[PDB]
Amino acid sequence: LECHNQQSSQPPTTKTCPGETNCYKKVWRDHRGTIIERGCGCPTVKPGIKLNCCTTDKCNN
């Protein structure tokens, strides 16, 4: 599938992963602030972190 992989404020870039069929989003908070990041695949979650996944393209625009 093909997905976008830019972080918080950088200009647009993308990558290709033929073998997987889904893309993912991750979000987390700490004492000083919070951050968000994008990727290929759909990994496990843990308490304190939040995660989400999609199957259509250009979902995590």
Swiss-Prot record:
Disulfide pairings: C3-C23, C17-C40, C42-C53, C54-C59
Tissue expression notes: Expressed by the venom gland.
Alphabetized GO MF terms: acetylcholine receptor inhibitor activity; ion channel regulator activity; toxin activity
CDD domains, A to Z: TFP_snake_toxin (cd00206)
Similarity comment: Belongs to the three-finger toxin family. Short-chain subfamily. Type I alpha-neurotoxin sub-subfamily.
Residue ranges of the TM segments: none
Keywords: Acetylcholine receptor inhibiting toxin, Disulfide bond, Ion channel impairing toxin, Neurotoxin, Postsynaptic neurotoxin, Secreted, Toxin
Localisation: Secreted
GO-annotated cellular components: extracellular region
Function: Binds with high affinity to muscular nicotinic acetylcholine receptors (nAChRs) (tested on Torpedo marmorata AChR, Kd=0.07 nM) and with low affinity to neuronal alpha-7/CHRNA7 nAChRs (tested on chimeric receptor, Kd=3 uM) and inhibit acetylcholine from binding to the receptor, thereby impairing neuromuscular transmission. Produces peripheral paralysis by blocking neuromuscular transmission at the postsynaptic site.
Organism: Naja pallida
Name of the protein in its database record: Short neurotoxin 1
Cross-referenced Pfam families: Toxin_cobra-type
SUPFAM superfamilies: Snake toxin-like (SSF57302)
